[PDB]
Amino acid sequence: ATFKLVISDPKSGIAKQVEITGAETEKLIGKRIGDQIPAKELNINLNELFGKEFPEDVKLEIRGGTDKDGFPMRPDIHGPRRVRVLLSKGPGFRPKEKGERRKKTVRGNTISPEIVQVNVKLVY
Amino acid sequence: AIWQGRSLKKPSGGRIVLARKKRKRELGREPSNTRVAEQDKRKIIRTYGGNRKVRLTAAAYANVFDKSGKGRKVRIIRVIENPANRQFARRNIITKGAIIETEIGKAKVTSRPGQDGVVNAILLE
Amino acid sequence: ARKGPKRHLKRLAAPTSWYIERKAYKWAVRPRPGPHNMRTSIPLLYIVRDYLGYAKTAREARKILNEGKFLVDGRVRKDYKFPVGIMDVVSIPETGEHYRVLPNRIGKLILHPISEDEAFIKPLRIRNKRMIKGARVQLNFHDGTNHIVSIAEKDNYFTSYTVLMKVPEREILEVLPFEKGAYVFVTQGKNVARKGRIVEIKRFPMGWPDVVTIEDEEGELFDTLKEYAFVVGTDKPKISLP
Amino acid sequence: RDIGLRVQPPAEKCDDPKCPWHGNLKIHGRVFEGIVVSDKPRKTVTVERQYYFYLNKYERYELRRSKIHAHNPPCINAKVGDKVLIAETRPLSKTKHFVVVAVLERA
Amino acid sequence: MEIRIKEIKENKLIGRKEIYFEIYHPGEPTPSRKDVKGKLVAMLDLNPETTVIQYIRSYFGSYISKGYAKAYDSKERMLYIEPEYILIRDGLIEK
RNA sequence: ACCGGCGGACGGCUCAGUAACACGUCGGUAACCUACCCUCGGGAGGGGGAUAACCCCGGGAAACUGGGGCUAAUCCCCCAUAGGCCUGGGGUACUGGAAGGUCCCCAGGCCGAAAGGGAGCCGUAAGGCUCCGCCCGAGGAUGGGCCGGCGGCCGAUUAGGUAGUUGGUGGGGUAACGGCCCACCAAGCCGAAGAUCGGUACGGGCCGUGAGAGCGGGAGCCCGGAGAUGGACACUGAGACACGGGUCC
Ligand SMILES: [Zn+2]
Numbered sequence: 001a002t003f004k005l006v007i008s009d010p011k012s013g014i015a016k017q018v019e020i021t022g023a024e025t026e027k028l029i030g031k032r033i034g035d036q037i038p039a040k041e042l043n044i045n046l047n048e049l050f051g052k053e054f055p056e057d058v059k060l061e062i063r064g065g066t067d068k069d070g071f072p073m074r075p076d077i078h079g080p081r082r083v084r085v086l087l088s089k090g091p092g093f094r095p096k097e098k099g100e101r102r103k104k105t106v107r108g109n110t111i112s113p114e115i116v117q118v119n120v121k122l123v124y
Numbered sequence: 125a126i127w128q129g130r131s132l133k134k135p136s137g138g139r140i141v142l143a144r145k146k147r148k149r150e151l152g153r154e155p156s157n158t159r160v161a162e163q164d165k166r167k168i169i170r171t172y173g174g175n176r177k178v179r180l181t182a183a184a185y186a187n188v189f190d191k192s193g194k195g196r197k198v199r200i201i202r203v204i205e206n207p208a209n210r211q212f213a214r215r216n217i218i219t220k221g222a223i224i225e226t227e228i229g230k231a232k233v234t235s236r237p238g239q240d241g242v243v244n245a246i247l248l249e
Numbered sequence: 250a251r252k253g254p255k256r257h258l259k260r261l262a263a264p265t266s267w268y269i270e271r272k273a274y275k276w277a278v279r280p281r282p283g284p285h286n287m288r289t290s291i292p293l294l295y296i297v298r299d300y301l302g303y304a305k306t307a308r309e310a311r312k313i314l315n316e317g318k319f320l321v322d323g324r325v326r327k328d329y330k331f332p333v334g335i336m337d338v339v340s341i342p343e344t345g346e347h348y349r350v351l352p353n354r355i356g357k358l359i360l361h362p363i364s365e366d367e368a369f370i371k372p373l374r375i376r377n378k379r380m381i382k383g384a385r386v387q388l389n390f391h392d393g394t395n396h397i398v399s400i401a402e403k404d405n406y407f408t409s410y411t412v413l414m415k416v417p418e419r420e421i422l423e424v425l426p427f428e429k430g431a432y433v434f435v436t437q438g439k440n441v442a443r444k445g446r447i448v449e450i451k452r453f454p455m456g457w458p459d460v461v462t463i464e465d466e467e468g469e470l471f472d473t474l475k476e477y478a479f480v481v482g483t484d485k486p487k488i489s490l491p
Numbered sequence: 492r493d494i495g496l497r498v499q500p501p502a503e504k505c506d507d508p509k510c511p512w513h514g515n516l517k518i519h520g521r522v523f524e525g526i527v528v529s530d531k532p533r534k535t536v537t538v539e540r541q542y543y544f545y546l547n548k549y550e551r552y553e554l555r556r557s558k559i560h561a562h563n564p565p566c567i568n569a570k571v572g573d574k575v576l577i578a579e580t581r582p583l584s585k586t587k588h589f590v591v592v593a594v595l596e597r598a
Numbered sequence: 599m600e601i602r603i604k605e606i607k608e609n610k611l612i613g614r615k616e617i618y619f620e621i622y623h624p625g626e627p628t629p630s631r632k633d634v635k636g637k638l639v640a641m642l643d644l645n646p647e648t649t650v651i652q653y654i655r656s657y658f659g660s661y662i663s664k665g666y667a668k669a670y671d672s673k674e675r676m677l678y679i680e681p682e683y684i685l686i687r688d689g690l691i692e693k
Numbered sequence: 694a695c696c697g698g699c700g701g702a703c704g705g706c707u708c709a710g711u712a713a714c715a716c717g718u719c720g721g722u723a724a725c726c727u728a729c730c731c732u733c734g735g736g737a738g739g740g741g742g743a744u745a746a747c748c749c750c751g752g753g754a755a756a757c758u759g760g761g762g763c764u765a766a767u768c769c770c771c772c773a774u775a776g777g778c779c780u781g782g783g784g785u786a787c788u789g790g791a792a793g794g795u796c797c798c799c800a801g802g803c804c805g806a807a808a809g810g811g812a813g814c815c816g817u818a819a820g821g822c823u824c825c826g827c828c829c830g831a832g833g834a835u836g837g838g839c840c841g842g843c844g845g846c847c848g849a850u851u852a853g854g855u856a857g858u859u860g861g862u863g864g865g866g867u868a869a870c871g872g873c874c875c876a877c878c879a880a881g882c883c884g885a886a887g888a889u890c891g892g893u894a895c896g897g898g899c900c901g902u903g904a905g906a907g908c909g910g911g912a913g914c915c916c917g918g919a920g921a922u923g924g925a926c927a928c929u930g931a932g933a934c935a936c937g938g939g940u941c942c
Contacts, residue, residue: 004751004752006750006751006752006759006760006761007750007761008749008750008760008761008762009749009761009762010761010762011762012749012761012762013748013749013761013762013763014748014749014750014761014762015749015750015751015760015761015762016749016750017750017751062760063759063760063761064759064760065752065759065760066751066752066753066758066759067752067753068752068753069752069753070752070753070754070755070756070757070758070759071752071753071757071758072752072757072758072759073759086939086940088928091758091759092757092758092759093757093758094757094758097928097929097938097939098928098929098930099928099929099930100928100929100938100939101927101928101929101939101940102939102940103939103940104757104758116752116753117751117752117753117759117760118759118760119750119751119759119760119761120760120761121760121761122761125926125927125934126866126867126873126874127873128866128867128871128873128874129873130714130873131585131857131872131873133855133857133858134713134855134883135585135586135855135858135859135882135883136854136855136882136883136884136888136889137854137855137856137858137859137882137883137888137889138854138855138883138888138889138890139889139890140713141710141711141712141713142710142711143710143711143713143715143918143919144710144711144715144918144919144920145919145920145925145934146926146934147838147933147934148932148933148934148935149726149837149838149867149868149932149933150838150867150873151867151934152865152866152867152873152874153865153866153867154866155865155866155874155875156865156866157865164803166803166804168804171726171867171868172725172726172838172867172868172869172931172932173726173727173868173931173932174726174727174728174930174931174932175726175868176777176778176804177778178778178779178803178804180803185802186801186802187779187780187781187800187801187802187803188781188801189780189781189782189800189801190781191781191782192781192782192800193781193782193783193799193800193801194781194782194800194801195780195781195782195800195801195802196800196801197801197802206863206864207862207863207864207876207877208863208864208865208875208876209863209864209865209875209876209877210876210877211876212864212876219863219864219865220863220864220865221863221864222864234779234780234781235779235780236779236864236865238865238866239778239779239865239866239867240778240779240780240803240804241778241779241802241803241804242778242779242780242801242802242803242804243779243780243802244779244780244781244801244802245780245781246780246781250918250919250920250921251702251836251837251917251918251919252702252703252932252933252935253702253703253836253837253931253932253933254702254703254727254728254729254835254836254837254931254932255703255704255835255836256703256704257703257704259915259916261914261915261916262915262916279835280730280834280835281729281730281731281834281835282729282730282731282833282834282835282836283730283731283833283834283835284730284731284732284833284834285731285834286834287834287835290834303609303611303612304611304612309612309679312679313611313612316611318611328730330730331730331731332730332731332834341611343610343611344610344611376832376833377788377789377832377833378787378788379787379788379795379796379831379832380786380787380788380795380796380797381734381795381796381830381831381832382734382796382830382831383734383796383797384786384796384797385734385796386786386787387733387734387787387831387832388733389732389831389832389833390732390833392731392732392833393731393732393832393833393834394731394732394733394832394833395731395732395733395734395831395832395833396732396733397733397734397831400786400796403786403787408788408789419732419733452790453790454495454496454497454790455495455496455519455520455522455790455791456495456519456520456720456721456789456790456791457790492791493790493791494790494791495790495791496790496791508793511791514793515723515792515793516793517723517724517791517792517793518723518791519720519721519722519723519790519791520720520721520722520840520841520842521719521720521721521841521842523842529881529882531859531860531880531881531882532859532860532861532879532880532881532882533860533861533862533878533879533881534860534861535859535860535861535881537882540842542843544843544844548906548907553886554886555886556886557842557843559841559842560859560860560882579720579721579840579841579842580721580841581721581722581723581724581840581870581871582724582839582840582841582870582871583870583871584859584860584861584871584872585857585859585860585871585872585873586859586860586882587860587871588840588841588871589841
């Protein structure tokens with residue numbers, strides 16, 4: 001389970017990539033979108049990564065991600081399962097028409113070993 | 125959906141075969157069972173041609189008039205009788221023909237809650 | 250297979266009131282909704298191109314119309330699909346020309362030259378009369394136009410009466426009543442394009458229309474519908490109708 | 492009162508909302524004369540009208556029947572065999588689209 | 599080759615003059631557009647750079663060929679009104 | 694290039710299905726809806742919020758698609774007044790052949806608008822002129838929905854068919870009236886003048902033939918109806934349950 005986690009700084013609009021192979025992936029696994037995790041708990045030296053003087057209380061907010069198959073994660077579907085849902089808007093669908101609905105494949109909010117990329121927002 | 129097109133039996137007792145698919149303009153909506161509650165609940169429905177309807181699902185107040193045009197807003201307590209259905213009286217469902225009793229006595233409904241979203245009634249002498 | 254409104258009109262299916270070649274091409278302009286009916290109307294494109302021959306192509310006709318060179322009822326009309334109906338005044342100030350649209354003896358629409366002084370008058374038959382919010386009376390004319398008056402003047406107007414309106418100012422000039430001896434002009438039917446004086450009016454039960462008998466100049470008596478009888482005078486026509 | 496027909500109204504009064512004489516029902520369209528053949532259904536009568544149809548090829552006529560179901564207002568209590576007048580109205584039921592307006596003659 | 603002006607009309611909404619003419623000629627080739635325009639301009643005193651020959655049409659077994667032309671008041675108006683193809687055919691634009 | 698508006702429901706193709714108010718004709722809707730367009734009478738007041746594009750970082754073999762920041766509108770939301778609907782009591786002002794219609798006065802309630810936005814020419818500014826615009830009300834106009842009378846094949850080696858079936862009362866739903874649906878009350882309704890069932894078929898204007906009566910066909914053009922591999926469903930829109938849109942077998 002090699003994650004390609006993305007860290008985005010809301011105060012600068014800049015994002016960086018960090019690839020994590022094991023050990024630290026277990027703590028991330030099982031979490032749900034909307035949960036905060038201290039940066040130190042992931043052995044991330046984001047201060048030197050971003051060349052900043054980030055405080056010591058920085059916390060990692062997970063907002064979503066994707067899979068090996070490229071199907072995104074809907075923060076609304078419960079459980080670490082892949083489902084087909086008829087979507088009109090929101091994550092996983094781009095309407096392109098006034099009111100159309102198309103069926104797409106998505107995954108639940110909970111993180112699973114199948115996840116390959118996890119997006120994270122820095123919370124000071 | 126709730127089709128409201130032609131019947132499939134002739135008046136002579138014969139059988140009719142559909143010559144076309146169901147059309148959108150011929151479709152109805154689910155019945156609105158206005159129930160007495162502690163707070164009014166209404167919804168907006170977009171109808172044919174872009175027009176609009178106000179559907180009342182829960183009714184709390186009623187506008188009661190007594191022989192002189194003097195209207196009062198009085199809370200609904202219970203439904204006494206409803207000739208429309210034999211079970212509506214027991215299920216406490218308001219209907220255009222229902223008879224209710226409010227703080228100022230018995231009244232008979234004269235409006236259609238499912239079509240205009242208002243409960244109007246006349247006091248019974 | 251039909252799901253909504255039509256946008257096209259085949260030439261063979263065009264109204265019989267148009268002086269159009271029904272076999273030269275396939276399509277014809279579909280009139281936009283407007284003042285008069287489909288049968289008593291013709292798109293301004295045909296007036297500009299065929300009737301008058303001021304343009305040889307629809308592109309030229311559209312350019313001239315957009316240049317605001319044509320006035321109908323005293324107002325400049327730019328769209329080439331505008332309906333033009335009976336008792337309408339078409340004005341070309343640049344050439345100083347003025348025409349009145351009238352039915353023919355065979356039901357086709359024609360342009361009758363008129364005088365400049367007369368070009369400012371439009372007759373309008375009161376198709377209906379009702380009351381609107383407030384205490385005002387609304388009059389609906391044969392071309393779909395509307396006018397508003399006060400409750401005091403309610404008795405000054407009635408159905409089938411004629412009103413002479415000054416265009417484009419939209420001002421009342423005179424009211425011609427519908428009564429015995431009133432000069433009338435037939436707008437449609439078998440007796441279209443005939444004129445005379447009212448002689449008798451007959452009513453019938455249910456929704457059957459009224460029937461009116463008209464005496465022509467030569468003395469012949471004919472019949473038509475009251476709605477088809479258009480009042481255009483009292484003793485002698487106030488509008489040239491030959 | 493008159494409802495567009497040159498016929499005398501019924502003598503007595505009724506409270507049927509679907510009575511053109513004493514109700515909100517409006518009559519418009521065709522008017523027919525017929526003979527009542529059935530009156531069993533409640534407030535309904537079947538009116539039969541006979542007419543001749545011309546067969547071109549044989550240059551001969553043939554009798555034909557026209558059965559119509561019409562609403563029977565309480566004031567106009569039509570029976571079997573009566574000659575009645577009916578007028579077209581809005582759809583009142585699956586088959587009833589006419590209303591009896593008067594009884595031309597009673598059997 | 600003799601040109602007879604059957605009709606001349608003044609269009610004022612479109613600032614032009616419409617000329618209908620007939621070219622009578624005994625057995626000879628159908629007259630060319632350049633020759634027709636030159637003769638018409640010389641005869642009717644028109645502006646050479648503002649006349650466009652709509653057509654010169656010959657008929658079956660006839661010595662009279664009909665012709666329709668237009669003479670504008672303004673070069674800009676001519677360019678704005680006339681389609682490109684007719685002007686190219688008459689050789690008013692180099693293409 | 695993107696947001697945003699309109700259109701994409703017309704046109705084009707086929708005759709499968711359908712013996713039916715599908716089609717032809719005459720009438721009705723006083724029982725109903727309609728963007729575009731026309732006329733008249735009115736209005737445009739105060740606030741608020743996202744996000745596309747773009748930038749950083751991607752994921753996915755593709756098809757597609759995630760996270761973070763920064764923005765505008767004729768984008769979206771809220772408040773205010775006009776306006777819309779229901780009901781009760783009074784006067785009769787209007788059209789109609791006839792008012793459950795329209796108008797006026799009180800009463801109880803629900804719902805509830807806009808874009809003074811854009812362009813040009815002047816004007817020191819202010820302000821002005823013009824062009825295309827936005828919202829509400831009453832009418833039209835355009836395209837339809839629904840209903841009625843009459844008319845147009847063969848089989849009796851098919852004689853009985855019908856049970857929401859026929860009608861009623863009270864309601865629901867619809868844009869609209871209606872057993873269209875629902876709850877109860879009755880036994881009604883169709884039929885040898887051929888019901889029911891079965892065979893065949895898109896209907897008409899028309900065409901082929903004959904001296905005519907008549908017989909036969911009704912693909913090409915026009916009008917109307919259905920279908921988009923066979924079925925069944927819904928979203929957006931004035932209009933579709935939609936040939937080059939959507940969901941399931
Ligand atoms: Zn009665």
